[PDB]
């Protein structure tokens, strides 16, 4: 019901986005699989919004972004085509998955970010099915992303302990990404907070590797400037730099409830006004 | 089973009394299962001055959690004012901090999806997954919500090799849904814990607000005592409860209520023998007789 | 199981028998599993008669323990009279904690699941967790239960990460179930164990009405052999309880069993010769206990 | 199960139907018929009550105070303390006749036999392990006399810790709850052999309240093994002295002089078996002596 | 892919050397243990490679072997028995795995050479499953011998401070041993250097003991010449007997790296030659040992 | 970790191509992670040139190690001419026992296993056997194998009733492995020690060829001060390096390196200098001589 | 996570380098320079020996570009400091940590102890690895003598093993590049013939001299409440004859303590307050 709603609302987006659509046709298990697929509507964050990753957002403009929607221009050697895995890994709270919004915002290619609920199915056989509908719909509707959020639970570590249907579904999974590099605007991408849970062979899958680490000096001045934007903040009386410098170790989620948290306390008396700037002292009094 | 689902339909019933908005939406069959785990304010009997003691606490869990969640009207003038993605009750067991969640549960006006490990986890394949993702979907729907999921470091335990596929799953699953792609309106995850250190350093991370509930001092454990004795006879006289408080050492608010419980009872026997055969004001030495020092 | 399930089937019909308001509550399939484990005063043949030496700690388990939990009129005038959340049964072994459990059992009106681990845990997934969530159910449905497990330092273990998925995750939804957000009516989980400091502090603070069954004293040790030598001949002149009570330091109540099952035994070897001959007891004089225990 | 335990699980449920007739109507599920497979028919054991020299009063005190109290409940059924133990523990040094005991408890008491292992106790899987444990203890509730033999004990039934794994724990809990909790068994003994009698925990040890300490023999306890050892063998009339040889075997226990009377009727035999391996005699103190230390 | 091959190939071995073995069945953890089971061609040392233990191998062929591979010829008295175990102990290097060798070649009884790596897992009850079926093959393996080498490290002395899983492994194999159930015609052989390691249920389970201590001078002879066979030696200058006296304390090891090291000389003018493309001596000899 | 399996994977690539003919081998798990232990030539920057003062324990460990090991063909005319089944490099340290093993890592052309002592531990039960199982099978497979175990007289320890459980089923699996029933191939297992005697008697006797690596004398002190002192740019009329070899009394081949580390940073230190804002002569190497 | 941040500020070639859980702990220890708050000039009396020490050890380690004309001029396997205690080892080693530019990893013997089995041998191996993955690494065990003691037959297993792994893996197969040992302890007779070879520069930080006593003295009570003309530092320094530098710490915060008995109450310090604290 409301599936098969969300289901034939994404297929008139998308055919509302891309022409090429009106003639292409479908059957049960893709027409499941579009609920998983995002449009950058609903996703309210673009490029912009990430600070601290300049240099990693230039790296993916010249490998993620520009050969997957300009493959003409990336054209001159054959193997100039854009990778078939990236792994936007790091410790948790870097970005990573901002990096996977913006991705959908700004690049012109779908982004199918399936869920495991979807992919995994309690009838034997049938959760192959939903792969291979993955797969030939990422085909089919040639500009995407196969976005695989947290690599490390499914292809994991393998081993004999694990269930048959799931070694079933690593294979297979194995067995269409073999495909999948022949394809032309096709790619899958994953976005993990550890790396050793990752399969060995499925870490050779994705043949593209990013390093989103816990942000620097100079990365934290970024965060805290991109994180206190159309923000009514004050001048002499506030700097960012010895607050960037005191909040050592710090992710940029932890400046995310820091930037957040320390400006009700600024704002408790202003908010008590309608309950019934920020200082240099807020954000220092919660560390 | 027949009794579940009319639980189910009894708590879809309470919600669309509590807010007639949710009227004219639907639900999946996971997410109607995960229904069964919603906590209404009837339920919870225990009330934000039920718990004494954590007074700053109770402050702090109400401008810097509730009130963000609660009325977005007014914290929407900067839209960084937002409530947290997380809210962990941690500290020593024996505090009230799942008496924080019920007083939370029943008067802050939110949805309270009290979610067990049990309603969880699924036998059968990829279900828990579906589970998870309804459980999201529900609170998405429920605008206001908040899930709490009591003992958290078990669920959110930290990964390892030994960890089932399923769990791994599970995990990974809750993360995607918690943060990130396709991102929740105003829906908390809150947890309570006793290990804090059990938990996943992403997990802990998607818990960024977290209350540390410790063990009460002297006059938390005066204000606790003086909690729990509400609604019994006193002494004018001969009651101490400040030289309790002071004897109480390392006493937590279960503890105290043990105590309280057993200098009640041996404060009544001779009430309690009469009335069984067909109060009394408490005193000090009642207390301090089951007090070791 | 086809014996599984008529053993739920006669509990179940045991417990309307004894209950007759539970007849339109019903339970699903894992609270039927659960039904199993119900023991009925019929299956316990221990009174609280029969136990000795503990009767001071008998009387305040009574009182703060069976008839707040039982007696809900009686203690309703104060909020504070209740029955504990747990009821902890610590000690060395042999002193009579079980024994308290089975005279509990018989004697108490409340419903008794004495559940055991191995019902517990299961090999499938999360199996287990929906095992102890409707054994918590069904204390509820019943309203005055008892939830006893016997070891309970095991079950109740303290938590590592060591620990298996299932265990942990075990023992969280005990403890949400035990003291969480919903609220249990009557129900209390009573354990009996030997290590009490192996048990977790959550779990110890969920057992706040804990007894000492300590090794029994001089006078104690009396007790309790008197309470064994019952429906027994003894002697009147010759034989002296006091002097075995003094002679017996150290010996737990299980000692003493055992002590009186070899005295009488030794009192019977000329009876049950005569006996199995075929296929009158002599009286029990302390020279019989007095040989058996080298002092 | 696999095809082999299936097969030896059918036989030992007929031969407990063909010994005791009344258990037909008795129906076990999965768990209980993977403990069939460790029941030990009299058939099994090849050895007599009277193939055990040394222990006669040893014997007799496991007889009176054990077997009869439980095999014959009609007799004793005139005192509430002429009952059964709920355990006995046979301990002492090893190589005295500990095991010799159980051979001939699993023979000729009259109960049937659980000689379990920890091989079939242990399972990888979580929660199966108690769950055998369960069903051994109500297998033995439904073979109403019954004997359940953990040959070396100590390491089943080890002191607890906080060290030991959970699934050894949960499972020497569940042990502890079935051998002595609520719903007690009606004729279920549990009899355990040992040579670390000081591993065992507190509690099993307290549910193992008949302990018979298999000592190191004496003497007249080597004379009387000894002979029965050399028994049904030629032996001689004038030149074997066979308290030569027991006042001779200082320290010696059961299972040395067993060896030692192999090795001396070995080179009794040698000149006899050197021609028979081509194509006995009577045994000597010369030969028991030869192989001696004095 | 490599183990179960292995388990293949000794159950393909084991059936052509006793056809009787065809109609058998295993356990899964009993085909696991047959990827230890040690085939005579395997082997390549006999008892004629050892020297020196001449009484001691007809002492392990008499009262060990033939009563183990000839029950026929010792069934008339029931005391003529194979012992329930074997101990080789000694020094280390004096030939306790050379008369394994020797046992598992020789003697027409199916070998079991375990280690420790197939019978220790990680999983719970595991290795006490692992003894188990070792047990039960070698039961079905009816003339069996199941080798233990280094037994001081398998049957050490139970201490409290031992591992659950080792305890109940090593109570396992007492159990399977001398319990009630049992063997028929299994015998377990253990080399080992520390005796006094082992516990003493498991010594007292081991009632054949051999000691196999360091060589006297004629066993000394008698090994050298051994480890000499193939060799030219010498005609007037060799003398095996100032030698084999002058080996005091030699060990079997002390004199086959010897017989080793006095090679590598005497050919070396032989091998310095053929690496670019002789009789011995007793001063050969000599050049290594110290008097 | 990511890294060590790629680790293995290196190796394992470059032992196939060292040898062609390793190809249908396949490797179990414990042997792969075994795999990581690998040295293979080109990982290691010294050869048997680069030691001096060993010039006869060269040879004599070249004519009873290498060549009965690498080269089988020319010793097979007599059994007695097989490679030992171990080998040990003992003495006082600093003498060059690494230096040895080094060059045997490189030249020998045999595969390599050094493994260290964390590889074969394993926190989780009868891993640490199967990781030793699965080491002495890997160098079966890859059949002219030396096992080299740097301070093999804490791995080879003397068995004690007070050693671990599983330190104690470790040492016996190795024991076994090494000379039991089952013969190994072309593995020596070679190990370098400062205590000799805490080694076990029958580890001892599995390592029968014994090399002493003792201290240097006049001339050796002389050579490994030439083999040191290469590539450096000496005094041509000032220098004597017999005087610095006499005065050097007692003094091992890392003290003679140390020394001529530091002869030469005060030599060119003035060079160094003006490098941020060399003639070595003896005098340099008798100021920190005594 | 703090310490990770400020390895990758300073010098962002390290974030490349991808690490393990052990390597994590080893990461625990690493001692970066925002922690320590005393240099090279807060060491007085000293001034050949800080020469010597830098010469020798900062300037081979952390510039061999400038060091490159031989392959003999690279930096130490590893430097022992001993010498009497309380002399000045501890700040030799904070302020090589500080002015070094290298990574300080000061690692404890209880760190690397673990509960479980062969734990503590991987917790070696990775902060071996981790000191090897950052090439200008120092890693800096405190009393050495307690960790790298003489191995004895009577050693314990694990740390026996602990030991000869260190050994290996300090001078071994697979030569560390860069890889630096710092070693501070007072008794250098404890340490094993081994690892006093793999510590081959050694540095006597013994009791200081007449003339160290008055660096010593002067570097100490710098910008203080020093007597104008009243202070006869060289009289102090003739007076206390084999004093430590430790003991110097304690006569001049007593002095202080006396003469801000009036400000506590509240440069009056003299030679009669310095006299009035020594024999
Ligand atoms: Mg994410
Ligand atoms: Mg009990
Ligand atoms: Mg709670
Ligand atoms: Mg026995
Ligand atoms: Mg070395
Ligand atoms: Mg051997
Ligand atoms: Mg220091």
Same mark, same amino acid.
């Given at each position: 019901?409301?599936? $098969?709603? %969300?289901?034939?609302?994404?297929?008139?987006?998308?055919?509302?986005?891309?022409?090429?659509?009106?003639? @292409?046709?479908?059957?049960?298990?893709?027409?499941?699989?579009?609920?998983?697929?995002?449009?950058?509507?609903?996703?309210?964050?673009?490029?912009?919004?990430?600070? *601290?990753?300049?240099?990693?957002?230039?790296?993916?403009?010249?490998? @993620?972004?520009?050969?997957?929607?300009?493959?003409? @221009?990336?054209?001159?050697?054959?193997?100039?085509?854009?990778?078939?895995?990236?792994?936007?890994?790091?410790?948790? *709270?870097?970005?990573?998955?901002?990096?996977? $919004?913006?991705?959908?915002?700004?690049?012109?290619?779908?982004?199918?970010?399936?869920?495991?609920?979807?992919?995994?199915?309690?009838?034997?056989?049938?959760?192959? %099915?939903?792969?291979? #509908?993955?797969?030939?719909?990422?085909? $089919?509707?040639?500009?995407?992303?196969?976005?695989?959020?947290?690599?490390?639970?499914? &292809?994991?570590?393998?081993?004999?302990?694990?269930?048959?249907?799931?070694?079933?579904?690593?294979?297979?999974?194995?067995?269409?990404?073999?495909? &999948?590099?022949?394809? *032309?605007?096709?790619?899958?991408? *994953?976005?993990?907070?550890?790396?050793?849970?990752?399969?060995? #062979?499925?870490?050779?899958? !994705?043949? =593209?590797?990013?390093?989103?680490?816990?942000?620097?000096?100079?990365?934290?001045? %970024?965060?805290?400037?991109?994180?206190? $934007?159309?923000?009514?903040?004050?001048?002499?009386?506030?700097?960012?730099?010895?607050?960037?410098?005191?909040? %050592?170790?710090?992710?940029?989620?932890?400046?995310?409830? !820091?930037?957040?948290?320390?400006?009700?306390?600024? #704002?408790?008396?202003?908010?008590?006004? /309608?309950?019934?700037?920020? =200082?240099? /002292?807020?954000?220092?009094?919660?560390?």
């Amino acid at each position: 019901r409301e599936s $098969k709603a %969300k289901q034939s609302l994404q297929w008139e987006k998308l055919v509302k986005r891309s022409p090429a659509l009106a003639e @292409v046709t479908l059957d049960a298990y893709e027409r499941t699989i579009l609920s998983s697929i995002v449009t950058p509507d609903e996703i309210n964050i673009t490029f912009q919004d990430i600070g *601290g990753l300049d240099p990693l957002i230039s790296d993916l403009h010249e490998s @993620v972004i520009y050969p997957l929607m300009m493959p003409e @221009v990336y054209s001159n050697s054959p193997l100039l085509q854009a990778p078939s895995g990236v792994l936007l890994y790091g410790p948790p *709270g870097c970005g990573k998955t901002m990096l996977a $919004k913006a991705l959908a915002k700004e690049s012109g290619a779908n982004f199918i970010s399936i869920r495991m609920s979807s992919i995994m199915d309690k009838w034997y056989g049938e959760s192959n %099915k939903i792969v291979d #509908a993955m797969f030939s719909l990422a085909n $089919k509707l040639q500009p995407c992303i196969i976005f695989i959020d947290q690599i490390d639970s499914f &292809l994991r570590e393998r081993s004999s302990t694990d269930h048959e249907v799931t070694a079933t579904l690593k294979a297979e999974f194995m067995t269409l990404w073999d495909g &999948l590099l022949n394809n *032309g605007r096709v790619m899958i991408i *994953g976005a993990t907070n550890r790396i050793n849970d990752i399969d060995d #062979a499925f870490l050779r899958r !994705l043949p =593209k590797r990013f390093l989103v680490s816990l942000p620097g000096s100079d990365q934290r001045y %970024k965060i805290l400037s991109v994180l206190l $934007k159309d923000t009514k903040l004050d001048e002499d009386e506030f700097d960012l730099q010895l607050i960037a410098d005191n909040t %050592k170790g710090f992710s940029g989620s932890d400046l995310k409830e !820091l930037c957040r948290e320390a400006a009700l306390d600024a #704002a408790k008396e202003y908010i008590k006004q /309608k309950r019934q700037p920020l =200082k240099t /002292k807020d954000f220092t009094k919660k560390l």
